Amino acid sequence: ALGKLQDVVNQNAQALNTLVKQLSSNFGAISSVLNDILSRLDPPEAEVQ
Amino acid sequence: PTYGVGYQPYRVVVLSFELLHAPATVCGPKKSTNLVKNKCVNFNFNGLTGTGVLTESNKKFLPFQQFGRDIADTTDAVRDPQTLEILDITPCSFGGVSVITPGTNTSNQVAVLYQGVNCTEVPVSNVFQTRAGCLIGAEHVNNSYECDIPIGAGICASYQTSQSIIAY
Amino acid sequence: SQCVNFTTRTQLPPAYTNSFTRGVYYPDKVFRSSVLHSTQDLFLPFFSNVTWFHAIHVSGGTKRFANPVLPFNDGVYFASTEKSNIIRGWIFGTTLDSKTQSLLIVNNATNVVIKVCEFQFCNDPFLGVYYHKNNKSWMESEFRVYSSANNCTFEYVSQPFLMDLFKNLREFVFKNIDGYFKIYSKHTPINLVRGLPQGFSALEPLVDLPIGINITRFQTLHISYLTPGAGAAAYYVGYLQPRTFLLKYNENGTITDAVDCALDPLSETK
Amino acid sequence: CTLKSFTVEKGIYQTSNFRVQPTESIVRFPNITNLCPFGEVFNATRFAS
Ligand SMILES: *[C@@H]1O[C@H](CO)[C@@H](O)[C@H](O)[C@H]1NC(C)=O
Ligand SMILES: *[C@@H]1O[C@H](CO)[C@@H](O)[C@H](O)[C@H]1NC(C)=O
Ligand SMILES: *[C@@H]1O[C@H](CO)[C@@H](O)[C@H](O)[C@H]1NC(C)=O
Ligand SMILES: *[C@@H]1O[C@H](CO)[C@@H](O)[C@H](O)[C@H]1NC(C)=O
Ligand SMILES: *[C@@H]1O[C@H](CO)[C@@H](O)[C@H](O)[C@H]1NC(C)=O
Ligand SMILES: *[C@@H]1O[C@H](CO)[C@@H](O)[C@H](O)[C@H]1NC(C)=O
Numbered sequence: 253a254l255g256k257l258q259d260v261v262n263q264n265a266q267a268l269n270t271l272v273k274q275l276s277s278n279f280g281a282i283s284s285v286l287n288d289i290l291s292r293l294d295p296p297e298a299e300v301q
Numbered sequence: 302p303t304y305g306v307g308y309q310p311y312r313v314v315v316l317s318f319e320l321l322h323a324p325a326t327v328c329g330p331k332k333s334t335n336l337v338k339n340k341c342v343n344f345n346f347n348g349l350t351g352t353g354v355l356t357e358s359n360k361k362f363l364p365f366q367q368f369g370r371d372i373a374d375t376t377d378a379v380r381d382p383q384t385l386e387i388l389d390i391t392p393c394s395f396g397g398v399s400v401i402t403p404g405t406n407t408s409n410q411v412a413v414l415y416q417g418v419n420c421t422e423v424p425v426s427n428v429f430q431t432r433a434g435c436l437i438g439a440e441h442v443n444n445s446y447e448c449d450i451p452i453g454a455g456i457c458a459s460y461q462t463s464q465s466i467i468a469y
Numbered sequence: 470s471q472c473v474n475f476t477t478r479t480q481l482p483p484a485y486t487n488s489f490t491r492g493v494y495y496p497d498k499v500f501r502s503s504v505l506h507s508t509q510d511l512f513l514p515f516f517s518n519v520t521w522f523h524a525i526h527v528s529g530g531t532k533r534f535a536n537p538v539l540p541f542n543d544g545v546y547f548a549s550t551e552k553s554n555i556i557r558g559w560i561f562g563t564t565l566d567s568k569t570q571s572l573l574i575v576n577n578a579t580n581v582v583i584k585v586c587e588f589q590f591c592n593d594p595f596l597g598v599y600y601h602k603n604n605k606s607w608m609e610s611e612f613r614v615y616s617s618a619n620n621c622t623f624e625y626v627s628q629p630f631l632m633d634l635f636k637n638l639r640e641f642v643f644k645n646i647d648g649y650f651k652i653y654s655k656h657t658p659i660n661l662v663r664g665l666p667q668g669f670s671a672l673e674p675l676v677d678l679p680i681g682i683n684i685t686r687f688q689t690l691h692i693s694y695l696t697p698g699a700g701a702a703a704y705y706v707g708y709l710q711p712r713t714f715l716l717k718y719n720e721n722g723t724i725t726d727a728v729d730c731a732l733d734p735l736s737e738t739k
Numbered sequence: 740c741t742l743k744s745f746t747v748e749k750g751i752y753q754t755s756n757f758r759v760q761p762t763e764s765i766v767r768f769p770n771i772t773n774l775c776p777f778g779e780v781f782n783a784t785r786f787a788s
């Protein structure tokens with residue numbers, strides 16, 4: 253019966269999860285973490301990724 | 302033994318380093334520093350880099366498991382490679398910084414609310430550890446009035462009587 | 470050493486069974502708790518065909534039953550059901566000769582020896598033990614596996630121990646990926662008499678070796694009980710495949726169960 | 740500066756974001772892999788021709 257509420261809550265959480273998981277996507281970059289690119293590639297090369 | 306240094310024996314050792322396109326088998330002693338807990342540090346455990354606060358943990362890691370991940374797929378816990386102990390990693394604290402201010406036409410005295418931060422990481426007279434965060438420059442008052450400037454978590458601040466900002 | 474030649478060579482016919490729901494192992498070394506996590510890697514699909522045979526460790530009686538050379542593919546799930554430790558090791562490679570580098574893993578009475586060399590494996594690798602009546606204990610005294618071993622590329626010997634010379638099920642997963650030979654192991658007491666047991670048990674990682682060689686075939690190594698003159702051990706083999714699995718880490722982090730997504734529509738929903 | 744105005748009315752304004760930087764760096768590795776036998780060469784009682 254409480255679904256109307258619970259449902260809503262889930263959606264919120266769901267969105268956040270998706271958002272957080274979008275931190276782990278390459279989007280075409282060599283890696284999905286900025287620190288690795290900064291530590292490996294020089295700014296002239298790193299900036300494109 | 303009585304020959305000149307030119308004719309005396311000399312033991313010679315030549316160290317050559319064979320570097321092929323194969324996994325390396327010989328390396329040097331890594332410089333492992335001391336462990337620091339309960340302080341925002343830039344840590345690197347066995348090549349796994351990160352930034353956060355290391356705290357003693359009660360998690361029951363299995364003997365072979367090293368890191369502890371979560372739904373976020375971020376390292377929540379680690380195993381200290383030298384001393385086999387489990388450390389929880391917490392992201393270094395942060396949060397919004399809001400300013401509770403009565404109208405400048407009224408006064409220029411303000412209070413600062415660091416939302417969602419404990420009153421220990423604020424460099425910081427009066428301090429209040431409200432559930433909404435650390436409030437600085439606000440005088441906690443037991444008396445309850447009508448909400449004037451809604452801070453949050455049931456706490457509201459107002460400019461009132463010499464006058465000052467009171468959080469109630 | 471010097472190979473021992475057997476005039477008569479034979480191999481028992483293969484048999485087939487169902488994998489049920491075994492072959493699940495921890496993909497990485499990341500701890501987790503009370504969480505359902507999806508991982509895409511080489512796993513043993515549930516209810517897959519499993520090719521199994523028997524290993525004769527005693528003759529009684531001049532016929533040499535030699536184990537067969539089996540392909541490796543992308544990895545092998547090898548199970549052994551036995552009372553005593555009959556299965557002792559394996560050999561991996563492509564040509565299994567001195568032409569190409571070959572790996573050899575063994576667990577003798579002393580310790581575990583893992584050597585990657587240009588081995589020249591014998592036709593019928595032989596491990597022979599004899600019963601010391603005075604000492605009332607078996608002692609290994611024959612090891613004729615490879616005729617030669619040249620240009621060794623890897624060697625690792627574990628610490629010495631004593632192996633004891635209600636069944637035991639020893640499951641192993643061998644995966645050669647990115648030049649790394651990963652071995653995962655599990656040991657359980659199984660009361661079943663015959664057939665691959667039906668149940669669930671995660672396989673903990675054992676060791677990763679950066680041998681960096683090519684493997685396409687492997688063969689099993691058994692122990693021979695020399696006697697002055699029936700309960701032969703059995704073993705099963707399955708081939709892993711690229712699959713997606715939903716693993717359920719419980720409070721302690723032990724994988725309590727797993728679901729094979731591509732097994733059936735219900736698992737796809739799960 | 741957040742509101743771009745000289746006059747600020749009563750209320751609470753999200754001005755900035757407070758973040759804590761790392762005080763120092765911690766590096767820990769498994770302290771012993773093995774121990775190369777260089778002494779067997781240098782401290783050998785007898786050397787070869
Ligand atoms: C290296 O780590 C091991 C692991 O417990 C420890 O026993 C040993 O004392 C350590 N050695 C040094 C020099 O700290
Ligand atoms: C300041 O506010 C008071 C009432 O709160 C008002 O009477 C006064 O005119 C205001 N001053 C200015 C400069 O607007
Ligand atoms: C802030 O830290 C102290 C000690 O670490 C703790 O007792 C207190 O509960 C913390 N603040 C909040 C709001 O939990
Ligand atoms: C508010 O009252 C509580 C008990 O009722 C007391 O402990 C606390 O010190 C009071 N605070 C102030 C600012 O007087
Ligand atoms: C395994 O393969 C054999 C023939 O290759 C077949 O007869 C048998 O039914 C298969 N196993 C299963 C469980 O279908
Ligand atoms: C072993 O290596 C040497 C030099 O790397 C080579 O001359 C020799 O042929 C190799 N062994 C075999 C069996 O080819």
Ligand SMILES: *[C@@H]1O[C@H](CO)[C@@H](O)[C@H](O)[C@H]1NC(C)=O
Nearest residue numbers: 361718719720721722723725
């Ligand atoms: C976790 O391990 C502890 C100690 O090994 C044991 O007492 C407990 O029952 C275990 N719990 C689960 C859920 O496996």
